[model samples]
Every structure is written in C-alpha cells, then in structure tokens.
Target: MKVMIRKTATGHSAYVAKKDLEELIVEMENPALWGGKVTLANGWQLELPAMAADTPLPITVEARKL
Candidate 1:
C-alpha cells in the first residue's frame, strides 16, 4: 500500500486520473483509507478524496504499465 498527493494545475480543475491502474498501488493516508479503482492508461478517470494541507497532489504513481 503506497501513498501520494495528487495535485492539479491551477487552471485545470482537480480530478482523479482513473486510467487503467497498472502495476502501481495508490492509497490515501486519511483514516478512511479510501481505496481507488484500478484503471488503464486510456481508461483513467479522476476521483476526489478528502485531502489535507500536507497531502500533495498527483500522488506517487507507478508507470510501468502506462
């Protein structure tokens, strides 16, 4: 289980890139420990989760499958 902060550009609205989650694992550090769905590159989608000031955007991503 890995964790990373997901950030979006100032001009671009915040969104979770839900493409085909390849061989990487992403998890939020919040107490809920929200789990995201696996998505492929072309199939990636964005999801919003509760984030704190410390949480970074664009969480750690394993791009082996991308």
Candidate 2:
C-alpha cells in the first residue's frame, strides 16, 4: 500500500491505493483521534485539515509501491 500527498491550488490532494484509501477514510472518520497528524502503516505522515501552500512548515507524505 502507498499514498502520496500533493499541494494544490485550493488545498491538498491525496493519491492512495484503493484498498488503503478505504482504510484511511475509515480512520479519518474520527478526526479527534488524529491529533493533527497521523502516521500510516507504511510510515508516511499526513497532516490533518489541509492548509494554504504558503503556510510555514508544511508537511508532506509520499510512498512507493513495491
């Protein structure tokens, strides 16, 4: 499983494996559990509530399929 997070004009976009996407959606159902950042099984960290691209210290996530 892999996922990628990209910065977009409006916000951020996430590209993830179909199966992983399903699990992520479920985990995200409860935002409070994330505490601002969540680390995936693959060790990719995703920041919650996308922010402006210009925001200082932006976080990004990237993963590669084996």
Candidate 3:
C-alpha cells in the first residue's frame, strides 16, 4: 500500500490514504525508519523500503503490510 511518513511534534506519523487512516509510529527496527519495519499505533506492522536517512518528510512510498 501507499504510505506517507512525516515528522510531527512528538515523533513520526504514517498516513495510509486507501484506508484514510493516520497513525503515529510507535516502534521501529531502525532509527532511520527507512530500511526496516515499523509498528503503528493502531497495531499495524509495515515493512518499508531501504532508503536514505535524510529522506524527505511527508514522502510517499510503497510498503508491505506484515
């Protein structure tokens, strides 16, 4: 699915347009959160692609739901 990741006041947030849902990232396998898995506040685990640490904010990417 297409997911948008961004930095907020507290931390990072993920947005899924297909579901019209937005959730904060509660857990991450990597500090950069680019080349690893991330757990959403809504109990969703998504595997993100391997990207650079300085990737732009509010960027959309393809993610696999685990």
Candidate 4:
C-alpha cells in the first residue's frame, strides 16, 4: 500500500490504499479521533482543519494489482 500527500497551487490531494482509506474515514468521522493530521510513510505530515464547505478533501483509492 502507498499514500501520497500533495499540495499544489490549486489545492491538496491525498492518495491512499483501500484499507488505509477505510481507516481514515472512520477516524475523520470521530471528532475525538480526528486530529486533523496525516503522517506519511516517509515521515511527512499533513495538518487538516475545518474548512469551507466549498473546499473538498481529495482522496483516491487504487485497484488491486494482478
């Protein structure tokens, strides 16, 4: 499984595996558990906080490999 956290001039993107994505969803659902943070495999980090409704969280899942 792989995950990438990207920030561009336009917006941010978070790509993650299905299993990890599931975990993230659950974490985000719980305010107590949601620290608005994500740590990458390379020790990188992303801090997410409450934003406008118009702003979106870009998350993507990859298909299984053959």
Candidate 5:
C-alpha cells in the first residue's frame, strides 16, 4: 500500500489513503515536528503535520501488493 501527502489551506498537511490505518505510528521525529493546522476545501480545520511548512510534500511510493 501507499499514501499521498496533501496540503491544506491553513498551511497544514494531510495524508490520503484508500482506507484507514490499522495502526499508524511514527518511528521517529517529535510530535511538534508534525504539528500544524489543516483547513480542508470544505472549510473544515484538522490537525496535521508541519511537513508542508515551506515546500509541499512529494508523493513517491513503491510497493508490491503480491
């Protein structure tokens, strides 16, 4: 499986996947590192990572589902 990082209006970030995570955990980095407020297109604000601070996050994934 793979995921995509998307940015919000409030200078925040979010992840997009086919389904919810069974167990999502960050192996490294402090929580603050992923700190930021996300404002969706629908005008809804959500808590997200600051990975999209200056530049937007890129989507580069490679995995096999076989």
Candidate 6:
C-alpha cells in the first residue's frame, strides 16, 4: 500500500490517501522508522522502505501492509 509519512508535533504519522486514513505511529520496530515495521494507532502495521534514514519528511512511498 502507498502511505505518506510525516513528522508531527509529537511524533510520526502515517496517512493513506486512498482510505482517507491517518494515524500516529505508536510503535516503531526501528527507531529510525525504516527497514522495519511500524504500528499505527489504529492497529495497522506497515513496513516502511529501507535506507530512509536521511529521507525528508512528508514523502510518499510504497509500503507493505504487514
């Protein structure tokens, strides 16, 4: 699935434009938020793209819905 991730005031967030869904990333497998799985507030787990340590915020990427 395609998810747009951005940095929020408190933490990171994930937005799915197709479903009009946005949720806070409550749990991150990797502190860097890449090459690992992230759990959203709504219990949605997504695998982010790897090597995104230096990637800018508010960027769209293809993620796996794990």
lDDT of 4 by residue, 24-43 (tens): 22222223212356443434
List clashing residue pairs in candidate 6.
none
When 3 and 6 are scored with TM-score, the better candidate is: 3
Residue 54, candidate 3: how far off, in angstroms? 5.6
**Candidate 2 structure, TM-score to reference:** 0.27
Better of 5 and 6 by lDDT: 6
**Model 6, span 1-66: residue lDDT tens:** 677888644568888766778998888887757667889999988777666652466778876777
- List lDDT for all candidates, in order: 0.32, 0.39, 0.75, 0.36, 0.35, 0.76
Quote each prediction's TM-score.
0.20, 0.27, 0.79, 0.26, 0.29, 0.78
Candidates in order: C-alpha RMSD to true structure: 9.3, 8.5, 2.0, 11.2, 9.9, 2.1
Name the weakest run of 10 consecutive residues (lDDT summed) in model 5.
20-29
Which candidate model has the greater lDDT, 1 or 3? 3
- If the candidates were sorted by their lDDT against the true structure, best first, what order would they fall in? 6, 3, 2, 4, 5, 1
Comparing 2 and 3 by TM-score, which wins?
3
lDDT by residue (15-52, candidate 3, tens digit) is 87678778988888777566778889999887778675
Worst 10 residues of 3 by lDDT: 50-59
**Where is the poorest 10-residue window by lDDT in model 2?**
22-31
Residue 40's lDDT in candidate 5: 35
lDDT of 2 by residue, 17-59 (tens): 4335422222321343223554444444554453332323323
How badly does each model clash, as a count of residue pairs? 21, 0, 0, 0, 0, 0
